[PDB]
Design a protein around this ligand. Structure first.
Ligand SMILES: N[C@@H](CC(=O)O)C(=O)O
Ligand SMILES: N[C@@H](CC(=O)O)C(=O)O
Ligand SMILES: N[C@@H](CC(=O)O)C(=O)O
Ligand code: NA
Ligand code: NA
Ligand code: NA
Ligand code: NA
Ligand code: NA
Ligand code: NA
Lengths: 411, 415, 405
């Protein structure tokens, strides 16, 4: 009774099997059953994603503050970042534009707790800007609030790279040993991470088994409404940005696609900016780009500059809002712009943590995942991430290929 | 004004001196005094036991997940574990049977806070099975809830033994240094542990000084009711299990006891599965058992398979329940079976943390130690653990001697 | 660093009465507040980790083991000097009355001094029931009793028979220490916001009652300074003279270990300097080689006195008559703070943190905290002045103990 299988199908057959199993259960008779039996395995999966973050988000971002230690020369790739921001900023814009045309979410009245979502109005920015600084990092980290457990983790690890340097030898030996422990927790988390991706097949099955039992069936159409709103928005900015800003330069925008070939192919199948990096790296070499340019910019387009993930989140948010029976207002709309950018700037680049960074793009713009109406809707859109992750990644990689080819004009 | 003394008497003379001091105080006059003066040193001791666990239970169980790392060959001692479960399962059964015959607890109406225990009914298993997974390990660990601070500590340390292996050299150097820190906290805890066992003489005195002042005196008889319910249950399964399943095999069950001699003796005096392990190890060699058998099984009967501790907890629970004025219901009864097994599978094997694993066998089956009625009763039974620990351990060791001798009938040899 | 906060102090003093008249409405009390407050929190962050990390180090620092005979003599001395220092601070905070002449009301509802819980129940709640919890949500008096009992227990693990257990004990302590340091790195960075946030908070609390509040903080300055110099004469020049050692020429071959202590304001920087100085005044190796590094982190004479004044300052600033017993608790607290204080620049003031938490004056109360903001504000003055003694006090001890053959 054994586990072996390439998981990113295991989940996807979990999904299509879940969808097809779900629909046929609630229809035929026992609309309940699944709520009492199956859902509790989705409830499980959910929890395990959350079990992560806090350690991962601490540990990782202490490492990624020893990784970047001044000198951290952002004095020649000013050009590339300036570009990356605008594309990602325009991507989420385009997502909100696509979540206008299509209205995913509406046509579902999620009541969950015998009671629909009421939106609790945001506190002043004074008070939230100040509550990036923890009053006690341990507390902040502990009970769970994250935006201090960023500001601390960074300010610890940025300060730690001035201790390995310090005059004293034994102080540098102390600074090291702490960082050598924090890192490794980072890794140990990543070892459990993979193991959660091994329960992910069960998890996803149980989620969109429940959704398709309780609340049929033009919820299918609704989630397929997302699929399009995402997809013919993704492909709607490949034409509207890349094919545009390359043409309006002088670079050949059409044959660019042909010598990006397999950096594009894999991005869709691997669904990873990690896997599609020695492939995107080679592809820049293969279309004949200069070393110090693509050698610095394509690894910075890896973690920074997720164009598709910014757009994906700018749709998912809208989906949730309307699914709750909440008319998502303007300003909030352009907060989502600035939030989804500042999420899809820190999103992972593996498979999952696009959706599990959307997490916070919802927490911002009063829509927290504590409210069960929110969460049960999040469960839906996180359920079908496995579809809109493979499709999404393809752009995240192409957007920093195009930037690397646009900036290749500097001599 | 100096401390030196072999402590496991220091406590026990603390107890008998506490008992004899306590009774004569509340009787003669100042029934109070002790409540204001002496109890606050028992209140202290209690807290220090609790100060522990959370670090120890984390740190230890990250180590004991790097200790067992797949490959962790449970492919030949399937036999021994299969046995161990049934004995421990039947032990707590027998404890609940003994806590039926004897009714310890009842005949005390513990009101503590001017108000008796009311039992708050258990939540669905769905919701408690799910709350083994922490939503935030740090939080879980922090404010104190433990069953996530297990599931995390294990899943960290099990995952950590696939990082020292990992292709990268410097990643294995990072994984090590974390585990080399967590371990050592484990040890540092164990250094305070010993220091608490050095206040334990005071602590125990102060506990069963207070109990014997406020609430005399057929509380003596009540706690002695426990003593028997435990003891003539312990000895009631030596005859009923070991002397039975060895006889119904063909192995000589009576002379087994004679070449176990000093593995039994020390178990009662040392009150330790740690101390009685080179002794139980030798004793298996001395009664002529095969190496690869007792060399693998007697160290696994060390921490897993505590027969007596399972039974002890299956009585202590019942004691508490009835002491509160709470008729401990069935199902709960057989939850105690499954709980006390899954406590006496992880109990320590030093002296204390039989009682301080009962801790959780009470938290399960709605009887938490937050409630002062519970806790003041727990203070009683944890008070006299020093009596029912030495007596208890003797079985915990004998039960995996017998298993090792029962499984010694398997021969043999592969291609 | 000093001349950015003392011109800091007068870009607060005046900008309050020239933007409490020309400066209209909440707008000028906005960017006072947000910048008072993006200090306040930014400050409050530090206290806990530091108080844990530091006091695990200052329990491996003092360990009943390998302290002897060379190291029984020196500590015995160090305790008494630091114990007598904070005594002298409380004596100086008697003569001068800093704090009084300010009625800090903060939350329209001044600090009504809070009456001390039954002592049974607070003595018991020094022992944490779960250190993690205690540390986490913030309560400190357990996060002392644990941190100490961890690091005291840890110095019996590096010793332990097993080699690999000593390698494990080390690596933990080598991580905790370093967090200590990492904190001290942020510490300095907070002292860099201290100008435009602790003389932006000051910007308002010098905007009201101005003709009695500069000269209240300058009242501290003296109470500290002519107490520091008042024990150089009263202890060192005394106990060296009453021995036979030449107490006056001692100062001359300490020269640059004294100089730097005032400019560097660091027991870290003034350690290869104080080390050399002991060599240069011709002290024996195994003596000053063991004692001057133990006078580094243990034995802060000035920091003990500084805290024994700062506390009193705060108390009286609140409208709270700081009672006796509390007075001699401060003696035993400030010693057991200035035994674990950092020896960089900041974490004298950010160990006073806990000497206030002890003796019911916690920093959760905004009346306390806004007053702490004042005295932590001008630490940059009384840190350079303070350090000079912290170093001289273990030079003198090293020279006093140099008489053993
Ligand atoms: N699938 C994304 C990462 C994510 O958003 O989860 C990528 O690799 O680009
Ligand atoms: N005394 C037991 C351990 C315990 O239950 O506390 C043993 O060593 O077997
Ligand atoms: N400035 C002190 C340290 C402190 O109290 O912050 C020293 O170096 O001695
Ligand atoms: Na990317
Ligand atoms: Na990203
Ligand atoms: Na055993
Ligand atoms: Na056990
Ligand atoms: Na010093
Ligand atoms: Na110090």
């Amino acid at each position: 009774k054994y586990i072996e299988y390439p998981v990113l199908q295991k989940i996807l057959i979990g999904l299509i099997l879940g969808a097809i199993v779900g629909l046929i259960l609630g229809h035929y008779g026992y609309a309940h059953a699944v709520h009492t039996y199956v859902k509790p395995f989705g409830d499980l999966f959910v929890r395990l994603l959350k079990m992560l973050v806090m350690p991962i988000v601490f540990a990782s971002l202490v490492v990624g503050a020893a990784s970047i230690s001044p000198a951290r020369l952002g004095r020649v790739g000013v050009k590339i970042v300036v570009y990356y921001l605008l594309t990602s900023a325009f991507a989420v814009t385009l997502g909100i534009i696509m979540a206008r045309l299509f209205n995913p979410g509406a046509g579902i009245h999620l009541a969950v707790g015998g009671q629909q979502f009421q939106p609790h109005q945001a506190p002043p920015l004074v008070h939230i800007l100040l509550d990036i600084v923890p009053t006690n990092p341990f507390g902040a980290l502990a009970n769970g609030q994250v935006l201090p457990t960023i500001f601390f983790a960074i300010i610890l690890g940025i300060a730690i790279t001035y201790l390995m340097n310090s005059e004293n030898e034994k102080v540098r030996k102390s600074a090291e040993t702490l960082l050598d422990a924090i890192n490794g927790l980072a890794e140990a988390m990543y070892k459990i991470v993979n193991g959660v991706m091994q329960y992910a097949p069960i998890g996803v099955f149980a989620l969109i088994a429940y959704v398709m039992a309780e609340q049929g069936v033009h919820v299918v159409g609704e989630l397929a409404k997302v699929t399009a709103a995402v997809y013919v928005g993704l492909t709607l900015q490949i034409l509207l940005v890349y094919f545009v800003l390359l043409k309006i330069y002088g670079i050949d925008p059409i044959s660019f696609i042909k010598h990006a070939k397999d950096a594009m192919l894999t991005a869709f199948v691997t669904s990873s900016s990690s896997g599609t990096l020695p492939v995107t790296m080679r592809v820049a070499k293969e279309m004949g780009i200069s070393e110090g340019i693509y050698s610095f910019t394509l690894p910075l387009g890896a973690t920074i500059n997720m164009d598709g993930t910014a757009l994906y989140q700018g749709v998912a948010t809208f989906f949730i809002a309307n699914a709750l029976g909440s008319h998502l207002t303007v300003g909030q709309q352009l907060t989502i712009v600035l939030t989804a950018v500042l999420a899809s700037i820190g999103t992972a680049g593996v498979p999952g943590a696009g959706a599990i960074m959307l997490a916070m793009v919802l927490h911002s713009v009063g829509l927290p995942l504590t409210d069960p109406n929110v969460a049960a809707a999040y469960a839906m859109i996180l359920g079908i991430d496995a579809i809109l992750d493979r499709g999404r990644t393809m752009v995240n990689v192409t957007g920093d290929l195009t930037g690397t080819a646009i900036v290749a004009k500097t001599e």
